[PDB]
Amino acid sequence: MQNQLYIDGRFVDAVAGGTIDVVSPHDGSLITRIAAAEAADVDLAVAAAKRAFPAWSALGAAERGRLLLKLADRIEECSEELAQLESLNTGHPIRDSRGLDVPRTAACFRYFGGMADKIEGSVIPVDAGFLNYVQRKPIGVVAQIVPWNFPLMFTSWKMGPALAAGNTIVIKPSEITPLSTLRIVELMTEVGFPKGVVNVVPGYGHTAGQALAEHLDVGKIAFTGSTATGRRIVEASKSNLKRIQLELGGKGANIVFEDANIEAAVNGAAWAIFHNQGQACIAGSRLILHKDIADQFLERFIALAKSIRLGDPMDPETEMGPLTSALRRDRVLSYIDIAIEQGGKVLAGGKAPDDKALANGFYVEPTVVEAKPQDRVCQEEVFGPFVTVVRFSSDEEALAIANNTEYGLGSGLWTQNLARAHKMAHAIHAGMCWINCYKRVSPGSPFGGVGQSGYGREMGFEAIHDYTEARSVWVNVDAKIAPHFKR
Amino acid sequence: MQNQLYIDGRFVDAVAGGTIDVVSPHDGSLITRIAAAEAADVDLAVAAAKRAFPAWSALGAAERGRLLLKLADRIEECSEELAQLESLNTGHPIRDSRGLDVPRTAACFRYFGGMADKIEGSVIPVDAGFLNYVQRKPIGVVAQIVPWNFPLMFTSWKMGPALAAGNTIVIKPSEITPLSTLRIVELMTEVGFPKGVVNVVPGYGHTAGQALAEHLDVGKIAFTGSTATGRRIVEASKSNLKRIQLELGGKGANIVFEDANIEAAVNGAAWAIFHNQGQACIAGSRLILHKDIADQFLERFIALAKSIRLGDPMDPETEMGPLTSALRRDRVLSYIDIAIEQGGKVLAGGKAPDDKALANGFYVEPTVVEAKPQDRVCQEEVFGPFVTVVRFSSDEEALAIANNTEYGLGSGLWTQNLARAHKMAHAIHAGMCWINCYKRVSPGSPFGGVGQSGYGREMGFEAIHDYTEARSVWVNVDAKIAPHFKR
Ligand SMILES: NC(=O)c1ccc[n+]([C@@H]2O[C@H](COP(=O)([O-])OP(=O)(O)OC[C@H]3O[C@@H](n4cnc5c(N)ncnc54)[C@H](O)[C@@H]3O)[C@@H](O)[C@H]2O)c1
Ligand SMILES: NC(=O)c1ccc[n+]([C@@H]2O[C@H](COP(=O)([O-])OP(=O)(O)OC[C@H]3O[C@@H](n4cnc5c(N)ncnc54)[C@H](O)[C@@H]3O)[C@@H](O)[C@H]2O)c1
């Protein structure tokens, strides 16, 4: 439905009339045309935000909170309208859009609604006679850039904290999946959000994206994307030394020890990499199995893989859908051919679906490939339904395999040994680690990377901190200075 | 005195024999020759640090704490030895090195010594049957770069937090003022700090400094310097997306209202800009006086300015010394000539004093210049004993003046009106604001900039947070999720 820029509370076309095609991943069909934002457009969106900020941040915190709260209830009223718009644009089964994407986007906004007035300053114990209080205040206009894997969920992950804190926002979704988030802004002002407090500006990365990260009135830039692109954001920020949050990606590891609950681990590991058609940043795209249970696991796992109802996203009975862009699909498939050239033994799937109906879309089937570590495809992020299997025999060997990546966003492990579980989670260099479960998120629990998967967290009290400055104020009440320059 | 690199617990020469002259700002005399660190040298210092990290962070926190605590006591034992070494190298009057520089360096280390085992993780309220605890862990190798205005104090400001947190350090002081901090590392290992846990690598900005910010094993780079140089640090960090802390400087404002206590304000304002020969970032290099008290203030202020015992840093009766480098002296003086070309009326000092002994050192005398805002010298940081005076008539005009800068790091204001004091401190865009006092710091009270004076704080619980990652661990104890892919 909606498809234009949203600047200062009005849906407007791109200043230079720019346009971008938004396609359905299921049949290649055109869904609609997006107003394509360019430098001149963001200049406006940011100016709109800059203008709206003083009044917005001047609102009592409780008020910003109440609006977020209503937005959350409102998103649930339009539960189906949204789940449908999203799954259509991204290829997410409605199985997911209805039960995950939407409720978790609302739950997140609700969290931060209840958060806005619980952000407290502090009073520092200090020299006698002085009073040092430190206020925690909004940074200013905040620029946010997201990818296209959870377009809907990201709106809550990203704007949720920034808004509660009192910041004013300019957000550029994925030229590939803007539709979802455009409806959200409408829902915002429907619920009472002042004009200009939020501004959506879909557009190419090197136009909208770059113009945004470079902008001189933008006080912080919050980016979720690839390591490659993260560097172009860092470069951009040097213009006015704006703060940065980097949510780059990772090759999440998924270890299964000898004493694991094979059934639960197969189901977890399958949900881990295959849910959301493998386009999860936290996706366990590296399996790591103990020798003694490796065979027994793959028997049950591969079976499960081949029996996955893959098809039309709009089918309530569809378990897995297509990749969200034609490009990627391509990419992935080349990553598969590559894994074979290095001696990979493809154990399930491996190419596009046989079906005539299926090949109108960017589909690829559940792929599992046996390999060695230090292989090219066990290092670089294959952003698809693609799992590599390796085997280990000692705890220490498993840790070594899990840490031999330049990526450390997420990882998990399956055991029933008290010591082993905690020892491992402590040793693995990763921003988060799941035991006997996987891909569990929750607003309030810090979500972010470590090292080359970036800095800054989303979700928690941590998230709020990232969107807030510290004004320190000293008041001399009862302490009398003795002149430094003694008369 | 002590003059070589310090890498892996040994004083060593630069790998390529490089050398740098360290001069006394009082007479131009040579003090000694510093081993000049270059790329190859930091490669070692960082490797030493990377190696020492595992063991160091593995120590119980309380242990790291105890060492910091002893280092603080030890620094006070060598109180004079250091105050003397510092004031000699920097031109800081001893009266200042003895009573300020040294005790505040110890105090800060002592703070963070008591802090190391009070850094707590958190346990998140989460879905029933799960247990989500979030540990707060060290980053790894931390690189720190400092300027030359408080060489001694910075060692505590910077390494204090980083070490307590469990990080391992590689620090590049100011080629111009390395001596002070070299002694400190010796003191560290004297007190029991493992070899490699701290590494000092004095050297040129574009050799040591650049190689350090670019290094791929460095997990965070903490920089204190100029806005100009800050951008080169941001560029460098794109190599491995290392975290950044920036403390670029600022043109601190110092407002005096009609109802001020004008004696106390003259003494504060004088201490503000002239203490430490004006080479304070937080230095009030912009006076702002109400019409009704402007004249009366300057009468008392200018008198005080001209009556400032300016001379030999080693004289216990010296009130103000030289600038720490010949290049600054020269820049500065040019900034003075500039203020005149724009119609500035120099009210006190204005050129190099013309004394005998002082004709050899990089001296400049207390300068006060009447001007208008928007003038070139009221915008750019004159890093010297240099105050510009402007006048205002309404509160609102004063705020406008104080905010018309790119910089936002130091502000102060003098009033006795409850409302005015708080309203103002809340409106001024600055990371910290002092009322009826100035340049008051304290470990525990966050010290940092806002906007183009950078991000990140030193000195507080905040400071600890900037030197620490968040590992989130999920444990499934009583969870029986339906398999996502329903059989
Ligand atoms: N850390 C997390 O929580 C998290 C969550 C979801 C996805 N991801 C990561 O997202 C990635 C997928 O997205 P991608 O393949 O399109 O990478 P990408 O960096 O090219 O695209 C991401 C977004 O940034 C914008 N962009 C592209 N180039 C830009 C530029 N030069 N300047 C400014 N902005 C620009 C795009 O328009 C887009 O919407 C993965 O590698 C994955 O791991 C991370
Ligand atoms: N915000 C604060 O807490 C704070 C505290 C003290 C000083 N300051 C600011 O610091 C300034 C003084 O420093 P400056 O005039 O010598 O400029 P500067 O930034 O060049 O010098 C400071 C340090 O930066 C390092 N450095 C320089 N060039 C580098 C490069 N190309 N790559 C990596 N590292 C490099 C140097 O080797 C040096 O020791 C002031 O303007 C002042 O207000 C800010």
Whether the CB-CB separation of A257 and A417 falls below 8 Å is answered with yes
Cβ of A234 within 8 Å of Cβ of B240? The answer is: no
Ligand 2 atom closest to the Cα of residue B205 is 37
Question: Which DSSP string do the residues of A357-390 spell out, in sequence order?
Answer: TTTTS-----EEEE--TTSGGGTS---SSEEEEE
Nearest CA-CA partner of B292 in B270, B260, B266, B264: B260
| B95 annotated ligand binder | no
**Residue among B38, B86, B247, B370 flagged as catalytic:** B247
Sequence-ordered list of residues with C-beta below 8 angstroms from that of A97, at least 6 positions apart, any chain: A82, A83, A84, A86, A87, A152
**Residue among A281, A370, A378, A433 flagged as catalytic:** A281
Alpha helices (H) along B59-150: 61-77, 79-90, 94-96, 102-113
| B108 annotated ligand binder | no
Contact list in B for residue A267 (CB cut-off 8 A) is: 483-485
- What's the rounded Cα separation, in Å, for the pair A463 and A456? 8
Q: B264 - beta bridge partners?
A: none
Cβ of A471 within 8 Å of Cβ of B430? The answer is: yes
- What's the rounded Cα separation, in Å, for the pair B135 and B119? 10
- Is the minimum CB–CB distance between A431 and chain B shorter than 8 Å? yes
Q: Count other Cβ atoms within 10 Å, centred on residue A354.
A: 8
The structure was resolved experimentally with X-ray
Alpha helices (H) along B442-483: 461-466
B276 DSSP assignment:
G
**Binding residue ranges of A:** 146, 148, 172, 175, 226, 229, 247-248, 281, 328, 381
For residue A462, the SS3 value is helix
Distance B235 CA to ligand 1 centre (A): 20
- What's the rounded Cα separation, in Å, for the pair A196 and A45? 8
Q: Could you tell me the resolution of this structure in angstroms?
A: 3.1
At position A23, the amino acid (one-letter code) is V
For residue B238, the SS3 value is coil
Question: Considering CB atoms only, which of A271, A445, A484 is closest to B275?
Answer: A484
Tell the residue number behind the tokens 């200049």, with chain if given. Answer: A43
Contact list in A for residue B275 (CB cut-off 8 A) is: 484
| B433 annotated ligand binder | no
E strand segments, A45-113: none
- What's the rounded Cα separation, in Å, for the pair A177 and A198? 18
Beta carbon of B225 within 6 Å of any ligand 2 atom: yes
| B248 annotated ligand binder | yes
Q: A346 - beta bridge partners?
A: A369
For residue A400, the SS3 value is helix
Distances (CA, A) of B33 to B24, B201, B309: 12, 14, 31
> Which of A241, A422, A457 best tests the B interface by mutation, with the highest count of B CBs <10 A?
A241
Rounded to 5°, the CA angle B405-B410-B412 comes to 105
Distance A249 CA to ligand 1 centre (A): 9
Sequence-ordered list of residues with C-beta below 8 angstroms from that of B153, at least 6 positions apart, any chain: B101, B104, B105, B108
CB pairs under 8 A between A and B: 197
Nearest CA-CA partner of B358 in B306, B320, B328: B320
Cβ of B483 within 8 Å of Cβ of A270? The answer is: yes
Contact list in B for residue A484 (CB cut-off 8 A) is: 267, 270-271, 275
For residue A222, the SS3 value is strand
Distances (CA, A) of A399 to A284, A405, A411, A413, A423: 15, 11, 11, 10, 10
Sequence-ordered list of residues with C-beta below 8 angstroms from that of B416, at least 6 positions apart, any chain: B259, B260, B261, B436
Exposed (0-12), middle (13-18) or buried (19+): which is B303, by Cβ within 10 Å? exposed
- Is the minimum CB–CB distance between B121 and chain A shorter than 8 Å? no
Beta carbon of A209 within 6 Å of any ligand 1 atom: yes
Which domains does chain A show, CATH number per domain?
1-249+443-487 (3.40.605.10), 250-442 (3.40.309.10)
Distance A148 CA to ligand 1 centre (A): 8
- What's the rounded Cα separation, in Å, for the pair B15 and B37? 8
| B146 annotated ligand binder | yes
Look at phi and psi of residue B98 and say left if phi exceeds 0, alpha if psi is from -120 to 50, else beta: alpha
Q: Is B437 a catalytic residue?
A: no
Distances (CA, A) of B326 to A241, B24, B28, B177, B224: 29, 10, 8, 13, 21
Cβ of A231 within 8 Å of Cβ of B246? The answer is: no
Q: What are phi and psi of A472, to 5 degrees?
A: -95, 125
B14 Cα to chain A: minimum distance (Å): 30
E strand segments, A277-366: 286-290, 345-348
- What's the rounded Cα separation, in Å, for the pair A14 and A18? 6
- What's the rounded Cα separation, in Å, for the pair B320 and B90? 12
- Is the minimum CB–CB distance between B99 and chain A shorter than 8 Å? no
- What's the rounded Cα separation, in Å, for the pair A4 and A239? 29
Beta carbon of B145 within 6 Å of any ligand 2 atom: yes
Contact list in A for residue B471 (CB cut-off 8 A) is: 425-426, 430-433, 450
- What's the rounded Cα separation, in Å, for the pair A291 and B268? 73
Beta carbon of B147 within 6 Å of any ligand 2 atom: yes
Nearest CA-CA partner of A228 in A402, A456, A452, A410: A452
- What's the rounded Cα separation, in Å, for the pair B436 and B422? 12
| B56 annotated ligand binder | no
- Is the minimum CB–CB distance between B427 and chain A shorter than 8 Å? no
Beta carbon of B247 within 6 Å of any ligand 2 atom: yes
Question: Considering CB atoms only, which of B238, B264, B433 is closest to A235?
Answer: B238
At position B269, the amino acid (one-letter code) is A
In the stretch 185-244 of chain B, residues with CB closer than 8 A to chain A read 219, 227, 230-231, 234-235, 237-238, 240-241, 243-244
Whether the CB-CB separation of B156 and B183 falls below 8 Å is answered with no
What are the tokens at B245?
């802390």
A6 Cα to chain B: minimum distance (Å): 27
- Is the minimum CB–CB distance between B459 and chain A shorter than 8 Å? no
Contact list in B for residue A434 (CB cut-off 8 A) is: 474, 476
Nearest CA-CA partner of B105 in B180, B7, B179, B6: B180
Contact list in B for residue A442 (CB cut-off 8 A) is: 124, 126-127, 132
Q: What are phi and psi of A252, to 5 degrees?
A: -55, 130
Cβ of B426 within 8 Å of Cβ of A471? The answer is: yes
Ligand 2 atom closest to the Cα of residue B173 is 39
Rounded to 5°, the CA angle B261-B265-B267 comes to 125
- What's the rounded Cα separation, in Å, for the pair A469 and A250? 29
B105 Cα to chain A: minimum distance (Å): 16
- What's the rounded Cα separation, in Å, for the pair B89 and B56? 32
Task: Collect contacts of A349-352 with beta carbons under 8 A, ≥24 apart.
Answer: A349/A305, A349/A306, A349/A385
E strand segments, B77-235: 122-124, 130-137, 141-145, 168-172, 198-200, 220-225
Handedness of CA B263, B268, B274, B275 (dihedral sign): positive
Beta carbon of A213 within 6 Å of any ligand 1 atom: yes
Question: Considering CB atoms only, which of B444, B447, B469 is closest to A125?
Answer: B444
What are the tokens at B171?
């620090």
Nearest CA-CA partner of B219 in A326, A406, A236: A406
Nearest chain A Cα to B443, which residue? A126
Q: Is B247 a catalytic residue?
A: yes
Q: Count other Cβ atoms within 10 Å, centred on residue B418.
A: 8
Closest C-alpha residue for ligand 2 atom 26: B205
Cβ of A469 within 8 Å of Cβ of B431? The answer is: yes
Ligand 2 atom closest to the Cα of residue B281 is 43
Distance B144 CA to ligand 2 centre (A): 11
Q: A177 - beta bridge partners?
A: A174
Q: How big is chain A by its Cα radius of gyration, in Å?
A: 24
Question: Considering CB atoms only, which of B122, B230, B445 is closest to A241?
Answer: B230
| B157 annotated ligand binder | no
Cβ of B475 within 8 Å of Cβ of A436? The answer is: yes
Question: Considering CB atoms only, which of A124, A267, A450 is closest to B445?
Answer: A124
B18 Cα to chain A: minimum distance (Å): 31
